[PDB]
Amino acid sequence: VHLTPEEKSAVTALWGKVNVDEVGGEALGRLLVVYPWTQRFFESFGDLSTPDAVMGNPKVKAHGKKVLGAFSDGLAHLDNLKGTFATLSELHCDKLHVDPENFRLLGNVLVCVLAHHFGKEFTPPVQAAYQKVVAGVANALAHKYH
């Protein structure tokens, strides 16, 4: 997408303070709690039956870290989110069959999680720049579906 660079360095400063190991697991955790029909791709992960299980479940924390490490790769290729994500886009389509509307739902839980985590420091204009990145990644990752 293009961010004005007042947007670009908004996103980039904030993200240098993130814990990708812990916002990882909370974002993918709260997706599986707040939108429970998304647990259909993760039953192999165990006990996902209360909120406190989902959040305690270490495969959930582990793969969140892996979701959020790839996320950080495109925050570094913001110019080119499509070539950077063409491969996982193909992979979520063709080997994982993930409905790309879930990419929008993780998008918006990640913005709730960054508000949570940065408090007042996640101002209306940093959110607005971060709604433009998570639509960009959701888009980039829907990219190779057919």
Partner 1 sequence: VLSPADKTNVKAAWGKVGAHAGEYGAEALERMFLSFPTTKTYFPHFDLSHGSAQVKGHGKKVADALTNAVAHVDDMPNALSALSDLHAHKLRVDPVNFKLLSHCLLVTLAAHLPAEFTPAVHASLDKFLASVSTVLTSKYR
Ligand X SMILES: O=P(O)(O)O[C@H]1[C@H](OP(=O)(O)O)[C@@H](OP(=O)(O)O)[C@H](OP(=O)(O)O)[C@@H](OP(=O)(O)O)[C@H]1OP(=O)(O)O
Contacts to ligand X by CB under 6 A: 1-2, 82, 139
Candidates 1-9, 18-26, 66-74, 113-121; binding stretch for ligand HEM (CB under 6 A): 66-74
Query: Which of 5, 6, 44, 52 touches ligand HEM by CB under 6 A?
Result: 44
Q: Which residue is at the shortest CB distance from ligand X?
A: 139
- Helix ranges, 49-119 (H): 51-56, 58-75, 81-94, 101-118
Give the C-alpha separation, 93 to 76, whole Å.
Answer: 24
- Biggest alpha carbon–alpha carbon distance for the chain: 43
Judged by CB under 6 A, how many residues of this single chain contact ligand HEM? 17
Choice between 32 and 133, CB closer to ligand X: 133
Minimum CB separation from partner 1 for residue 6, in Å? 13
**Nearest Cα residue to 88 out of 62, 54, 63:** 63
Query: Which of 20, 53, 70, 115 touches ligand HEM by CB under 6 A?
Result: 70
Give yes or no for a contact between 3 and 132, defined as CB atoms under 8 angstroms apart: yes
Residue-wise burial string across 27-60, b where 16 or more C-beta atoms lie within 10 A, e elsewhere? bbbbbbbeeeebbeebeebeebeeeeebbebeeb
Q: Does 41 bind ligand HEM (CB under 6 A)?
A: yes
Residue 100 token pair: 């790309």
Annotated binding site for (2R)-2,3-bisphosphoglycerate: which residue ranges?
A: 1-2, 82, 143
Q: Does 102 bind ligand HEM (CB under 6 A)?
A: yes
Chain residues binding ligand HEM by CB under 6 A are 38, 41, 44, 63, 66-67, 70-71, 88, 92, 96, 98, 102-103, 106, 137, 141
